[PDB]
Design a protein around this ligand. Structure first.
Ligand SMILES: [Mg+2]
Length: 378
């Protein structure tokens, strides 16, 4: 995008409204959500000033001078739910028909030298709503998956961002990581006072490539190395990396052959050694890298769930008893064991994805790692 098209979009100042989403139930066993327009204390509609921009139709981001904390506070005050599990999220919307557009809060010209946002790249372990908006709010079904998250609540990146009180800008899609990098590079050219050294990047991918597309280990390794080359060349300094959990331990592989399981598992182990090597490579160059061994953690969770506060690591919480992508389009009841224990005691929500309690557990172990993240300046 041209420097003239950047200033041209920035000068096209308007306003929009804020859609405040929330979990309707007080229990995380129920994924259903609803929304209200953010209001001011006087009862008038809350608006934010700024400019829109999109590289392609309906894929709009709204850029505002208003901070994420001010917007979050307006939603909290408007909703007044007395719901400890409200799990509020918010977006820019002109009216009830708008998609859920991400609000980018522009940084100040005089930012201190400290991490001030999280930018996530990856797949369904990280997506907070991209494929959901792209599918017109149909995939995954919003009665059985929490508002576009492939789980019953927040994913690990949201828990990390929450713990550090940082805004989270998500590029993960439940379109490839190379395209997500290109998209991140394009949208941030429209951001004001953007310094990539103040961004904490999260990156996880490879499971979809091995599980769904049967991609070779070298091509996935090459794409991963490419994503880090492109981000570091564009000024990225801070990363949270993770090894891949062995997805063959998820319930969906009850329905796969042993030969398929062994193939995928072998690819995962090879990729994980490469991820560890990549983390070392960037650490050696002076980058701030936090590597967490999610693979080792999932081996423990799936072999001894009781040692980690879980009762079941073998079945989905949802009553899904097959592996079919069609199931993401429909509403499902919880299976009896999960309705009895609560979803906070199951490792898996559906046949593939962790519950939000597992996502929180992973986030907390990641936050602990590298001496409470001693190389990052928050
Ligand atoms: Mg490649």
């Amino acid at each position: 995008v041209s420097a003239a098209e950047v200033v041209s979009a920035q000068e096209n100042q308007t306003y929009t409204y804020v859609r405040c989403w929330y979990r309707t139930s007080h229990s995380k066993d129920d994924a259903a959500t609803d929304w209200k327009w953010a209001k001011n204390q006087d009862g008038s509609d809350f608006t934010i000033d700024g400019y829109w921009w999109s590289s392609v139709s309906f894929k709009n981001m709204f850029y505002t001078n208003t901070s994420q904390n001010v917007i979050r506070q307006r939603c909290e005050e408007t909703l007044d739910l007395a719901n400890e599990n409200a799990d509020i999220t918010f977006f820019a919307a002109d009216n009830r028909y708008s998609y859920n557009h991400t609000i980018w809060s522009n940084d100040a010209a005089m930012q201190p030298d400290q991490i001030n946002k999280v930018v996530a790249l990856g797949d369904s372990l990280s997506d907070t709503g991209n494929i959901f908006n792209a599918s017109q709010w149909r995939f995954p079904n919003p009665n059985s998956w929490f508002l576009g998250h492939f789980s019953n609540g927040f994913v690990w990146t949201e828990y990390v961002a929450k713990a550090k009180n940082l805004p989270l800008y998500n590029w993960a899609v439940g379109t490839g990581v190379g395209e997500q990098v290109s998209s991140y590079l394009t949208y941030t050219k429209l951001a004001k006072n953007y310094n990539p050294a103040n961004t904490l990047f999260t990156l996880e991918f490879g499971l979809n490539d091995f599980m769904n597309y049967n991609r070779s280990v070298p091509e996935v390794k090459a794409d991963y190395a490419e994503a880090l080359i492109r981000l570091t060349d564009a000024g990225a300094k801070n990363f949270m990396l993770m090894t891949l959990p062995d997805a063959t331990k998820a319930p969906q592989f009850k329905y796969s052959t042993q030969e398929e399981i062994e193939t995928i598992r072998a690819k995962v182990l090879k990729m994980n050694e490469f991820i560890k090597a990549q983390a070392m490579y960037y650490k050696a160059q002076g980058y701030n890298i936090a590597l967490f061994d999610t693979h080792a953690l999932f081996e423990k969770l799936t072999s001894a769930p009781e040692e980690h506060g879980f009762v079941n690591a073998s079945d989905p919480c949802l009553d899904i008893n097959r592996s079919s992508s069609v199931d993401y389009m429909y509403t499902h009841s919880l299976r009896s064991e999960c309705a009895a224990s609560g979803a906070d005691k199951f490792v898996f929500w559906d046949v593939t994805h962790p519950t939000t309690a597992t996502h929180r557990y992973v986030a907390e172990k990641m936050l602990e790692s590298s001496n409470n993240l001693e190389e990052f300046r928050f």
